[model samples]
Target: NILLTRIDNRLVHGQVGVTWTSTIGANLLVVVDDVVANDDIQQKLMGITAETYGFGIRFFTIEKTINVIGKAAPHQKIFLICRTPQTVRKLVEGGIDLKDVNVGNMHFSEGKKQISSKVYVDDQDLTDLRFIKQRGVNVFIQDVPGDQKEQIP
Candidate 1:
């Protein structure tokens, strides 16, 4: 079962590994990113962080996720985390049944406009986000479990 699909640029970290995982009751954290899936060292590092938190972790490209996500076990409460809205949009486009998506941390950086304390977006971000919303998905910003869900319109 897909618990929460989130756009967190940091991927798996303490915020996600502990707070979100515990709050959402998600046992598996699947990272859908083309870049990271092909990087061995990055996966091992992230794998370590998730392992320390006692959560299952897996990495896949957007294409791979499209093929495997529907095949997830009924007991698998997957918390899908990725870097951007475009990636999530592709997952939706490719037949992933996502109803809600969380925006956790986009972090301030050059060329990105701040949407919240933890979320920043540029032109492409805005465009892709709008696309996701158009698909009838609820997209929101919430840094952690305690924060209010700020819906993106």
Candidate 2:
């Protein structure tokens, strides 16, 4: 049912819009971010972006995602997208079965340290990632489809 779990700040954009979807053979794109789920404009943008790649898209808050993920059909190939490691930690803590999470494009900010060319994480981010790993989820950093995955230290 679940194909891939990705943490990309841009949500459903260029790399994830086409590259990751086809690479994972995902038919459905589920974005679990409260801000984008509540914003009509952003939701529309994500929908349009996903549709461009011929993929079905759904936006949900963390709570809603935890509630609905179990209902998804086994035949559906779902690619889950979240904005941060914290969100993924929340989902994992809330009882969603996430085996692997790909750290995609976490843009650099003032207090964040660059982990890779496209990923930046703060102390809290690193803690949350460690917590997720402790729960048995494989967390790694990889920007595009062909890039080698770097495991979180």
Which one is best on TM-score?
Answer: 2
Give stretches of model 2 more than 4 Å off: none
TM-score of each: 0.93, 0.96
lDDT of 2: 0.89
- Top model number, lDDT: 2
Off by over 4 Å in 1: none
lDDT of 1 by residue, 32-129 (tens): 99999988677888888788888899999999999988899899999999888889989988988888898988877789888788889888888888
Tens digits of per-residue lDDT for model 2, 40-93: 687987777776778888999999999989999988899999999989999999
Q: Count the backbone clashes (under 3 Å) in each candidate.
A: 0, 0
